[PDB]
Symmetry: D2
């Protein structure tokens, strides 16, 4: 069963697109992310990601990745697990932190936004 294999094109509720290329045997993967949204006034560009998954009880292993935004000084990390429901539908449940670059140490308090995303496989 290839169900819940991270490898693939995924989309989230914001309309973002994400590709995860094949995992190596260490469980590390790379890919790219096309966000539909930005907190900057910059043109959105496809951006590389780098992550790792835990080794596979009936449960998909947890994974995480870092997106290196190509058009913004920021960095997002996403952490999640895949689930398959009744009718075979796969979903990535993810929580994320978006870190903006700040000029001095004293601005770090405001540098991190948090939220969640739900991804499903693009048909």
């Amino acid at each position: 069963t290839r169900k819940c294999e991270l490898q693939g094109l995924w989309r989230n509720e914001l309309g973002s697109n994400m590709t995860i290329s094949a995992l190596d045997v260490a469980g590390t993967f790379s890919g790219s992310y096309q966000t539909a949204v930005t907190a900057t006034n910059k043109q959105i560009l496809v951006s590389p990601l780098k992550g790792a998954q835990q080794p596979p009880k009936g449960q998909q292993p947890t994974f995480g990745f870092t997106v290196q935004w190509q058009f913004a000084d920021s960095t997002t990390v996403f952490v999640g697990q895949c689930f398959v429901d009744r009718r075979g539908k796969e979903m990535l449940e993810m929580a994320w932190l978006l870190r903006e670059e700040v000029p001095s140490r004293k601005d770090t308090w405001k540098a991190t936004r948090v939220g969640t995303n739900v991804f499903t496989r693009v048909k």
Copy 2:
């Protein structure tokens, strides 16, 4: 100036140790993490990490990484920026999400812990 180079051994306020190996030119890095603490009842083991930094205005670039815990079903992601103060002292300001593996989709609501860490370079 090698000030705020991620490469190195770092420690945080919890007494965790972290090594970041040299960055490649794409800005991706790997390394390992020795946490002083765990939310499981398992023996702590050194664990690989995989991350990426943004390219370097006077400001260090943001970075993120994923720790693949070797003794736990979980995954942590850390996101941060380095700062150098007056007397040349470097600090990584980081926020993180720890994701526990859960049996079903309905338990995802409780799967993510959040917090911050401050790292300084081991002498």
Copy 3:
């Protein structure tokens, strides 16, 4: 228009129920919360909440509240904004932190879970 008035019975995607009683003129409100889920092994009980909303540009004001769980040592805080869509449907977008009570200061790192909820008005 009473659209997006916090006053009311709301439900979230987890199937939790929440009542917010009338706001006073200072914008503070109280109410109760019936969670469908718990991270403890205790019987769920209806729990008081205490919050405040900002004063009302076309935008609903932000609000927050604290739930004092009656069956758990923990405390949740929720922060959010209400939205009304095209066909008049109201939704509370909320982010939350659940704080478990810990025995010593050194366990605080693991004490806080984070997530989001979406509430709609019970018909």
Copy 4:
């Protein structure tokens, strides 16, 4: 022992000041917050807060509150526990979410910043 009574003037690492007035018997409290920092370009003003603490094993009970900022469209909620160390020193360990008001539902993804604070009692 009045050790770890929330009632009092507290300060955090950012240099913010906070007053918590006496708790009522239900455990609800009010007070005010003077932040040293803001993410807006507005003049900072003292702001009311409204919270509740859990009832008091050797462990302080968890609490939470909402700050209704008087100079910003936002709302912060803080959740925490008090600790007393060896030499009698009290500390509030807190995690928080700052929610900015957004024009439409589609901007909610970026509306929530997260972080932590440590408060000690003003001498």
